[PDB]
Amino acid sequence: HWGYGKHNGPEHWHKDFPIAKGERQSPVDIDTHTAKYDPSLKPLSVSYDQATSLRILNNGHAFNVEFDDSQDKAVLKGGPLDGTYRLIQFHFHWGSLDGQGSEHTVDKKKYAAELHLVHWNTKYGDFGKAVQQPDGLAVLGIFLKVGSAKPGLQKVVDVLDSIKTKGKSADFTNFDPRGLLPESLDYWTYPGSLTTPPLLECVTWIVLKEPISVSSEQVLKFRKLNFNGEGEPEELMVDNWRPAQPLKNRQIKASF
Ligand SMILES: Cc1ccc(S(=O)(=O)NC(=O)Nc2ccc(S(N)(=O)=O)cc2)cc1
Numbered sequence: 001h002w003g004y005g006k007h008n009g010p011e012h013w014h015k016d017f018p019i020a021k022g023e024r025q026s027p028v029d030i031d032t033h034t035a036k037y038d039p040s041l042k043p044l045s046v047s048y049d050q051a052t053s054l055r056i057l058n059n060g061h062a063f064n065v066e067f068d069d070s071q072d073k074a075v076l077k078g079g080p081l082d083g084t085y086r087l088i089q090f091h092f093h094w095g096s097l098d099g100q101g102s103e104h105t106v107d108k109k110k111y112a113a114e115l116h117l118v119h120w121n122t123k124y125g126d127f128g129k130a131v132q133q134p135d136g137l138a139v140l141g142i143f144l145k146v147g148s149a150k151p152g153l154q155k156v157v158d159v160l161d162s163i164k165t166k167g168k169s170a171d172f173t174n175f176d177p178r179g180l181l182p183e184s185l186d187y188w189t190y191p192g193s194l195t196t197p198p199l200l201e202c203v204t205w206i207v208l209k210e211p212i213s214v215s216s217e218q219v220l221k222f223r224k225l226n227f228n229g230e231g232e233p234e235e236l237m238v239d240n241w242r243p244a245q246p247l248k249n250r251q252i253k254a255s256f
């Protein structure tokens with residue numbers, strides 16, 4: 001029962017997940033003046049036209065929009081990546097207030113939320129094998145700031161009251177994740193980990209520079225979700241983010 005409380009939050013995780021103190025933990029602060037342009041980076045290719053979303057699940061930590069990943073529909077290629085990575089799910093991390101919520105920071109700036117689109121390397125056959133490899137996953141990170149509404153997000157916001165508590169799910173077909181992307185695909189990249197237990201060091205992070213804007217009313221509905229299950233004391237699902245971890249022996253590269 002790791003979580004985000006004072007009793008089971010990020011400072012406690014290492015007792016059951018010792019890799020929490022590892023050499024390649026995520027997220028990190030992105031120091032823009034230390035990140036270096038890398039002309040070796042190939043163009044980023046986000047091919048989401050044939051995505052098949054399935055369902056939305058409150059897993060007690062966040063909510064995941066899940067995709068059919070039984071073939072190469074929605075894939076991520078290029079950039080720092082070797083080969084093809086299949087979209088399996090996306091989720092967010094967000095704050096109790098607009099001044100915090102993201103996992104990555106940018107010159108110590110916290111955004112209100114962060115979107116994670118999670119992909120696994122098809123050369124390993126399935127997600128479970130992919131998370132045993134140092135290049136098994138690619139996660140596309142996108143910051144959210146509060147301002148104008150994001151039309152592409154409203155369908156997500158409107159289904160949240162049907163998955164308020166842990167373990168609830170709902171059908172969520174025909175959702176196009178292309179409506180959650182910013183205009184620019186300029187990014188930073190570095191080798192890292194999952195940001196929740198099991199904290200496996202298997203991820204190529206690709207963090208877009210340009211945030212998307214969402215409205216106050218949209219993120220307010222995120223904050224009405226619960227960490228708890230039905231019939232249990234209500235604990236609002238807020239501040240489900242891990243803070244920045246030591247960069248150690250890593251270089252963040254800029255595509256721009
Ligand atoms: C009912 C059903 C089951 C399986 C599929 S599928 O096309 O094989 N897709 C699939 O398994 N997707 C999927 C599986 C696990 C996860 S998860 N649990 O890592 O969020 C996330 C996404 C499709 C429909």
Ligand SMILES: Cc1ccc(S(=O)(=O)NC(=O)Nc2ccc(S(N)(=O)=O)cc2)cc1
Binds near residue numbers: 195
């Ligand atoms: C060995 C193993 C594999 C998979 C799981 S799981 O719980 O089904 N999957 C899982 O945790 N997926 C996952 C976790 C964190 C992130 S994130 N936030 O780095 O984008 C993205 C995705 C648990 C244990």
Ligand SMILES: [Zn+2]
Binds near residue numbers: 093
């Ligand atoms: Zn995440």
